[PDB]
Amino acid sequence: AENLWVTVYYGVPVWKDAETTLFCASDAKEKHNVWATHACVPTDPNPQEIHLENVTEEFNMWKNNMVEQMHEDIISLWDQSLKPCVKLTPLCVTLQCTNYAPNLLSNMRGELKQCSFNMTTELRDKKQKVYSLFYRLDVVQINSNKEYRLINCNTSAITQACPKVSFEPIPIHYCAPAGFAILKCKDKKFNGTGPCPSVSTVQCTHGIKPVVSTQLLLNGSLAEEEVIIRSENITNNAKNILVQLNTPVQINCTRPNNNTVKSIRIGPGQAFYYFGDIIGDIRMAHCNVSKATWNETLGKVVKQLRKHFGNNTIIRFAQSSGGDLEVTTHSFNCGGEFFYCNTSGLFNSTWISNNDSIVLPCRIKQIINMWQRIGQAMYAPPIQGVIRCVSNITGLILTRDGGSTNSTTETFRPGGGDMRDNWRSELYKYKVVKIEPLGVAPTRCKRRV
Amino acid sequence: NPQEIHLENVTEEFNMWKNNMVEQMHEDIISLWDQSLKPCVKLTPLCV
Amino acid sequence: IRSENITNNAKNILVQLNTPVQINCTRPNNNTVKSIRIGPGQAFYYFG
Amino acid sequence: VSLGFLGAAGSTMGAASMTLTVQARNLLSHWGIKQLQARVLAVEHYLRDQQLLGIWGCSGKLICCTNVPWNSSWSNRNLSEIWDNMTWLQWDKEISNYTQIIYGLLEESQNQQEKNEQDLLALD
Amino acid sequence: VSLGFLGAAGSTMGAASMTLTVQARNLLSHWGIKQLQARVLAVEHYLRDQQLLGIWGCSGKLICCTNVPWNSSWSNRNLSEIWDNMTWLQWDKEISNYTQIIYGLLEESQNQQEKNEQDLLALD
Amino acid sequence: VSLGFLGAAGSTMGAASMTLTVQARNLLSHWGIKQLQARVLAVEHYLRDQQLLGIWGCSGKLICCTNVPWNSSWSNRNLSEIWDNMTWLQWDKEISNYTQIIYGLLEESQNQQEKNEQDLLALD
Numbered sequence A: 001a002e003n004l005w006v007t008v009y010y011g012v013p014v015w016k017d018a019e020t021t022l023f024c025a026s027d028a029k030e031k032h033n034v035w036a037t038h039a040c041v042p043t044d045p046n047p048q049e050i051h052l053e054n055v056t057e058e059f060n061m062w063k064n065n066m067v068e069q070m071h072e073d074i075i076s077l078w079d080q081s082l083k084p085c086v087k088l089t090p091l092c093v094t095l096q097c098t099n100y101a102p103n104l105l106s107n108m109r110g111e112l113k114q115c116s117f118n119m120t121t122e123l124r125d126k127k128q129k130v131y132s133l134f135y136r137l138d139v140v141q142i143n144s145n146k147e148y149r150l151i152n153c154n155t156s157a158i159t160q161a162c163p164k165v166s167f168e169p170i171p172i173h174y175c176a177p178a179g180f181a182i183l184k185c186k187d188k189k190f191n192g193t194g195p196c197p198s199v200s201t202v203q204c205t206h207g208i209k210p211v212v213s214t215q216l217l218l219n220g221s222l223a224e225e226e227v228i229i230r231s232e233n234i235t236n237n238a239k240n241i242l243v244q245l246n247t248p249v250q251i252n253c254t255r256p257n258n259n260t261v262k263s264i265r266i267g268p269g270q271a272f273y274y275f276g277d278i279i280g281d282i283r284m285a286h287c288n289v290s291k292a293t294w295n296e297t298l299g300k301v302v303k304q305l306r307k308h309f310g311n312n313t314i315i316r317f318a319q320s321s322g323g324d325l326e327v328t329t330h331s332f333n334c335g336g337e338f339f340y341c342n343t344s345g346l347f348n349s350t351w352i353s354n355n356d357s358i359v360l361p362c363r364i365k366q367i368i369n370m371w372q373r374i375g376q377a378m379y380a381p382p383i384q385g386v387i388r389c390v391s392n393i394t395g396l397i398l399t400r401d402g403g404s405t406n407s408t409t410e411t412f413r414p415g416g417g418d419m420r421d422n423w424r425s426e427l428y429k430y431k432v433v434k435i436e437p438l439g440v441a442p443t444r445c446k447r448r449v
Numbered sequence B: 001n002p003q004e005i006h007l008e009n010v011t012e013e014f015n016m017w018k019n020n021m022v023e024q025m026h027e028d029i030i031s032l033w034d035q036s037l038k039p040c041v042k043l044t045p046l047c048v
Numbered sequence C: 001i002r003s004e005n006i007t008n009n010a011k012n013i014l015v016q017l018n019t020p021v022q023i024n025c026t027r028p029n030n031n032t033v034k035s036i037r038i039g040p041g042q043a044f045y046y047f048g
Numbered sequence D, E, F: 001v002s003l004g005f006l007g008a009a010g011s012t013m014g015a016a017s018m019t020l021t022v023q024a025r026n027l028l029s030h031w032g033i034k035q036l037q038a039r040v041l042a043v044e045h046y047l048r049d050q051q052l053l054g055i056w057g058c059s060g061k062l063i064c065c066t067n068v069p070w071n072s073s074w075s076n077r078n079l080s081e082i083w084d085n086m087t088w089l090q091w092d093k094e095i096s097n098y099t100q101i102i103y104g105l106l107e108e109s110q111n112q113q114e115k116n117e118q119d120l121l122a123l124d
C-alpha cells in the first residue's frame, strides 16, 4: 500500500504531431457536372467546434502539409475531368488572316483577326472550308499578307473542354479520418507564426472556395478589426507579402458584345464549336472599381505597413515589371471565359508620412496554359450573349522590389503569380495531430488474486 | 450447396418497380461492356 | 548442378558458379545525337 | 455537464481521468480511393492497441488494475504532486524513455505468471 | 435441432432468445474493387457495436447483466405479457424513441461508477 | 531468454506452451493496390478467430479453462505421453478429423448453458 503499483489508462488526451491523407466532404443539396464533386460523402448539418482551455501550441504556416496536397488535389483532378473530352490535332494548320474595318475608335484597332483554313470532315478524303476569328493573343505569324499559326503548336497538344461541365467554384470541406483531429487558432490578429493562446478542435474545416486568380484574391474569406500583413522573412526581396483586407471592395467586370456561335463536325463523331461573328458594335471588356472605396482601402493598408518599415518613410506604389502575361496582369474566369486585365490605374499614387469609377481595360484569350506547365494546353468554347459577374476583392499580393541602402522608401508592385499563395490565405490556421490514447501512471491499487 | 432457410409466421410487404437490384444490374452491364471493348482494334479509316 | 529430370533433352541445366569471372563490354564510337519535332508537341531523338 | 472530445487536456491529471469515455467513443467514427485509404487506416490503428490491451489482462476495461511494483527509479516523485500539479501532456514527456521497459515487464511477468498459477491452482 | 440463420424471427421473444449463437457466427463470414468495397464495409459495421458492447461492461458475453433500474415510463407493461405475447420485430418498434436515453444512461452511470468504486474499494 | 517468432516449433508440447506471447504479438504487425489487398487480408484473418474465441467464453485469455469432458474416443492416450513425447505439429494431425465436433460441442453445451444458469441463479 505504501509502495505503488502501475495502472493502465485508455483514452487519455495527448496528441503529438504527424501527417496523413485527407478526403473531401461537401454538399448542400440540376447541378450536372463541375470539376468532380458528385457525392464525395455529403456533410453533416451541425459542425462540432469544441473550445479548449489553458492550452497553448506553437503554430507555423509556411511548413504545413495541408497546402502541399491541396495543390496536388487540383491539378490531378483537372486532368482527370478533361481526359475523355474531344481532342483536336487537326487544328494546327497554316492559316491566312486579315485585319478588320477602319474601326477608328483606336482601342480595338487591329485586335480581332478573321481567319480561314482547311479542316477535315467526316469522310477521310474530302475537305471542308471554314471561316472563324481569333483574338490577337492566339496567332503568331511566320516570319504584304502573311500566314499565321496557333500560339501553342510548337509546345503542347491542344484539347477542347467538354461543353457540358462548368468551372464555377463550389465550397469544399476537408475532413481528417477517424483517429485524428485538426486544431484551429481562434484569435483576431494573427501574424502567421507564433503561440496561439486559445485553440479549438474541429474535424472538418469551413467552406473553402477554390478560385483561381492572380494579383487580387477573389471571393475569399474576410478578416477582423484591422488588416494583417503576413510573410516569411521580410527584408528578403524574393518572398511575397500576403495582405488580407478588412472591408470588401466590389468589382463589376463584364463584356458588351453578343458573339454568335456555330458548330461543324471535325469527324467522324467529334463536334467543334468555333467562334462566329459579332453582332452590334465592338468595345473593350472592362471592369469598374468605385474610386471612393478604393482610396479608403489603400489608406488603411498603408497605415499598417508603417509597423514593418519604420514610421518615417514615404510609401510609393507602381506597375508590374514584365514577364509572361499571367504574372504582370490580373487574371480570372467569369462564367466560363478567361479575362486578362491590366490594373495600372490602381497601384499608382505615392504617399507621404504625415462618386467616380476607375476603368480597367481587359483583353481576352481563348487558349489557356494554366498552372505554369508545358505539355498540356486547353481550348475554351465561346458563350452566347453578354457576360456579367459581380465579385468582391478580399486580399492583395504585393512584391517588394530591391535596393541596397535604406535611402527613402522601398517601393511595392503586384505580381507573384505562383499558385500556392492562393491556398495559404485560408489554410493558415489548421494543423493535423494524432491521438495516442494510451498511458501508464502509479497509484495505490492492486489486482485481486 | 446454397442455404435456403424457411421462415414461419412472417409476412413482409413486397414491391417491384421500386427495387434497387434492377438499377445496378443495368449499370453493371453497360459499364462492363465498354471495359471489354476498350483495348480492341479501333478503325477510323473505314469512313471513306 | 540443378534441373528437373535430367535424361530429358528438352529441359535446361541451371549451373551456378563459385568464384566470379569479370567482363568488360564497351563501345568505342562517339555517336552525336540530334532532335527534331515529328509534331505537334512530341519530340524524336534520332541517331546522328 | 461533460465538456466534449479532448475536453480536459488543459486540466490536471486528477480531473481529466474522470471523463475518459468521451475519448473512447469518438475514436472509430476516381477519388473515392483516398476515402478508402482512410477507412482502412482508421481501423488498423484501432486494432493495434485493442490487441495490446488484450494481452495485458485488461480485456475490456478502462481503469484496469495490475500487479508489477513501481521501481521508483522511473519517477522519484510522491503520490500527491503527480495527480494535482501536472497535466497528461507533461507526464507523458517525463516518463518517456522508460516505456519499452514497462510494456515488456507488464505482460511477461503477469499473464505468463497468472495463467501458470491458475493452471497450477485449479488442479484441485 | 436448431433452425438456422434468422430462424426464429416469427417466434415469440421467450423462445427466440435461446438460439442466439446462430445470428452471431454468420455475421462476419477491374471489378474486384466492388468486392473490396464490400469486405471493408463488412468489417467496419462489425467493429462498431463490438466497440459498443466493450464500453457497457459486456465485453464478450451475449446475455449480460446490468444495474440501471427500469424507469417504467419507457414501457408500462408488466414483464410476462412481454416475453410471451410479442415478437422481437414488434418490441423494437414500441421502445423505439427511448433509446438514445438508454444508451447514454447505460454506460455513464455504470462504468463511470463501478471503476470509480473499485479504485476506491481496492485501496485496502 | 526467449527464442523468438515460431521459436519452439521443434520442441516438445510441454515446453512450447510457456512462450505463447511471442506468436500473439507479431500476428497483426498503380502498385499500392497490392499493398492494400494485403492490409485488408491481414486484418480479416485476425478478426475471424478473435470472434471465435469470444463465443467460447475465452474472451481475452490465452490459457482458458473449459468444462466439456474428454470423450476418450478422440484420443486414447494418457496424460504423460502427450505432453512429453509429441510436438504441436504432430498432435494437430492425429486429432484432425474430430474437430468440427469439438468446435460445435465447445460452445453449444457451455455458453448456452452457463448464461442460462446465471440468469436462473442471479434471480435471487
Ligand SMILES: *[C@@H]1O[C@H](CO)[C@@H](O[C@@H]2O[C@H](CO)[C@@H](O[C@@H]3O[C@H](CO[C@H]4O[C@H](CO)[C@@H](O)[C@H](O)[C@@H]4O)[C@@H](O)[C@H](O)[C@@H]3O)[C@H](O)[C@H]2NC(C)=O)[C@H](O)[C@H]1NC(C)=O
Pocket: A166, A168, A169, A211, A218, A219, A332, A333, A334, A335, A388, A389, A390, A391, A392
Ligand atoms: C464570386 O462569387 C460570385 C457570387 O458570390 C460569383 O457570381 C456568380 O457568377 C455566375 C456566373 O454567371 C452567376 O451564374 C448565373 O448563370 C446563369 C446562366 O449561366 C449558366 O447557367 C446554367 C448552369 O450552368 C447553364 O445551363 C447555362 O447555359 C449557363 O452556362 C445566368 O442566367 C445568371 O444571370 C448568372 O450569370 C451567378 O449568379 C453569380 N452569383 C450571384 C450571387 O450573382 C462570381 O462568379 C465569383 N467570382 C469568380 C471569379 O468566380
Ligand SMILES: *[C@@H]1O[C@H](CO)[C@@H](O[C@@H]2O[C@H](CO)[C@@H](O[C@@H]3O[C@H](CO)[C@@H](O)[C@H](O)[C@@H]3O)[C@H](O)[C@H]2NC(C)=O)[C@H](O)[C@H]1NC(C)=O
Pocket: A094, A095, A096, A116, A117, A118, A127
Ligand atoms: C486548302 O486546300 C486547298 C486545296 O486545293 C489549297 O489550295 C492549293 O494551294 C496550293 C498552294 O498554293 C496550290 O499550289 C499552287 O500551284 C500553282 C500552280 O501554278 C503554283 O504556281 C503555286 O506556287 C502553288 O504551288 C494549289 O494549286 C491549290 N489548289 C487549288 C485547287 O487551287 C489551299 O492552299 C489550302 N489552304 C488554304 C489556307 O486555303
Ligand SMILES: *[C@@H]1O[C@H](CO)[C@@H](O[C@@H]2O[C@H](CO)[C@@H](O)[C@H](O)[C@H]2NC(C)=O)[C@H](O)[C@H]1NC(C)=O
Pocket: A140, A154, A155
Ligand atoms: C514556339 O513559338 C513561339 C512563338 O511566339 C516562340 O516564342 C518566340 O520566340 C522568339 C525566339 O527568337 C522570341 O524572339 C519571341 O519573343 C517569342 N515570342 C514571344 C511572344 O515571346 C517560342 O520560342 C517557340 N518555342 C520554342 C521552344 O522555341
Ligand SMILES: *[C@@H]1O[C@H](CO)[C@@H](O[C@@H]2O[C@H](CO)[C@@H](O)[C@H](O)[C@H]2NC(C)=O)[C@H](O)[C@H]1NC(C)=O
Pocket: A222, A247, A248, A249, A391, A392
Ligand atoms: C462580398 O460578397 C459576398 C457574397 O458575394 C457578400 O455576402 C453577403 O452579402 C449580403 C448583402 O449585404 C449580406 O446580407 C450577407 O450577410 C453576406 N453574407 C455573409 C455570410 O455575411 C458580402 O456582402 C460582400 N461584401 C463584403 C464581405 O464586404
Ligand SMILES: *[C@@H]1O[C@H](CO)[C@@H](O[C@@H]2O[C@H](CO)[C@@H](O)[C@H](O)[C@H]2NC(C)=O)[C@H](O)[C@H]1NC(C)=O
Pocket: A258, A279, A385, A386
Ligand atoms: C444578341 O443576339 C441574340 C441572338 O439572336 C438576340 O436574341 C434574339 O435573337 C432572335 C433571332 O436570333 C430575335 O428574333 C430575338 O428578337 C432576339 N431577342 C431579343 C430580346 O431581341 C439578341 O437580341 C442580341 N442582342 C443583345 C443580347 O443585346
Ligand SMILES: *[C@@H]1O[C@H](CO)[C@@H](O[C@@H]2O[C@H](CO)[C@@H](O)[C@H](O)[C@H]2NC(C)=O)[C@H](O)[C@H]1NC(C)=O
Pocket: A250, A251, A252, A288, A289, A290, A357, A390
Ligand atoms: C457594381 O454593380 C452593382 C450591381 O450590378 C452595383 O450595385 C448597385 O448600384 C446601384 C447604383 O445605381 C444602386 O442603386 C444599387 O442599390 C446597388 N445594388 C444593387 C443590389 O443593385 C454597384 O454600384 C456597381 N459598382 C460600381 C462601382 O458601379
Ligand SMILES: *[C@@H]1O[C@H](CO)[C@@H](O[C@@H]2O[C@H](CO)[C@@H](O)[C@H](O)[C@H]2NC(C)=O)[C@H](O)[C@H]1NC(C)=O
Pocket: A320, A328, A329, A342, A343, A344
Ligand atoms: C497598362 O496600361 C498602360 C496604359 O498605356 C500601358 O502602357 C504604359 O503606360 C505608361 C503610362 O501611360 C507608359 O509610361 C508606358 O510606356 C506604357 N507602356 C508600357 C509597355 O508600360 C501598360 O503597358 C499596360 N500594362 C500592361 C501590362 O500592358
Ligand SMILES: *[C@@H]1O[C@H](CO)[C@@H](O[C@@H]2O[C@H](CO)[C@@H](O)[C@H](O)[C@H]2NC(C)=O)[C@H](O)[C@H]1NC(C)=O
Pocket: A344, A345, A348, A349
Ligand atoms: C499615375 O499617377 C500620375 C501622377 O499622379 C498621373 O500623372 C498625372 O495625370 C493627371 C491626370 O489628369 C495629369 O493632370 C497630370 O499632369 C499627370 N502628371 C504627370 C507628372 O504625369 C498618371 O496619369 C497616373 N496614371 C494613370 C494610369 O492614372
Ligand SMILES: *[C@@H]1O[C@H](CO)[C@@H](O[C@@H]2O[C@H](CO)[C@@H](O)[C@H](O)[C@H]2NC(C)=O)[C@H](O)[C@H]1NC(C)=O
Pocket: C019, C020, C021
Ligand atoms: C562481383 O561484383 C561485385 C560487385 O560488382 C563485387 O563486390 C564487391 O567487390 C569488392 C572489391 O573486391 C569487395 O571488396 C566487396 O567485398 C564485394 N562485395 C561483397 C558484398 O562482397 C565482387 O567482388 C565481384 N566478384 C566476385 C563475387 O567474385
Ligand SMILES: *[C@@H]1O[C@H](CO)[C@@H](O[C@@H]2O[C@H](CO)[C@@H](O)[C@H](O)[C@H]2NC(C)=O)[C@H](O)[C@H]1NC(C)=O
Pocket: C030
Ligand atoms: C566526342 O564528341 C564530343 C562532343 O563534341 C567531344 O566533346 C567535346 O566537344 C566539344 C565540341 O562539341 C569540344 O569543344 C570539346 O573540346 C570536346 N571535349 C573534349 C574533352 O575534347 C569529345 O571530345 C569527342 N571524343 C571523345 C569522347 O573521345
Ligand SMILES: *[C@@H]1O[C@H](CO)[C@@H](O)[C@H](O)[C@H]1NC(C)=O
Pocket: A233, A234, A235, A236
Ligand atoms: C531569410 O531566411 C532566414 C532564415 O531562413 C531569415 O532568418 C532571414 O530573415 C532571411 N535571410 C536574410 C539573409 O535576411
Ligand SMILES: *[C@@H]1O[C@H](CO)[C@@H](O)[C@H](O)[C@H]1NC(C)=O
Pocket: A295, A296, A299, A349
Ligand atoms: C484619398 O484619401 C485621402 C485621405 O483619405 C485624401 O487625402 C486624398 O485626397 C484622397 N484622394 C486621392 C486621389 O488620393
Ligand SMILES: *[C@@H]1O[C@H](CO)[C@@H](O)[C@H](O)[C@H]1NC(C)=O
Pocket: A311
Ligand atoms: C510610429 O508610430 C507608432 C504608432 O503609430 C509609434 O509607436 C512610434 O513611436 C512611431 N515612430 C517614432 C519614431 O516615433
Ligand SMILES: *[C@@H]1O[C@H](CO)[C@@H](O)[C@H](O)[C@H]1NC(C)=O
Pocket: C005, C006, C007, C008
Ligand atoms: C521426366 O519426367 C518424369 C516425371 O515427370 C521423370 O520421372 C523422368 O525422369 C522424365 N521422363 C522420362 C521418360 O525420362
Ligand SMILES: *[C@@H]1O[C@H](CO)[C@@H](O)[C@H](O)[C@H]1NC(C)=O
Pocket: A053, A054, D010, D011, D012
Ligand atoms: C485553467 O487554469 C486556471 C488557472 O490556471 C484554473 O483555475 C482552471 O480550473 C483551469 N481550467 C480547467 C478547465 O480546469
Ligand SMILES: *[C@@H]1O[C@H](CO)[C@@H](O)[C@H](O)[C@H]1NC(C)=O
Pocket: D071, D073
Ligand atoms: C530498477 O531499474 C534499474 C534499471 O534502470 C535496475 O537496475 C534495478 O534493478 C531496478 N530495480 C528493481 C527493484 O528491479
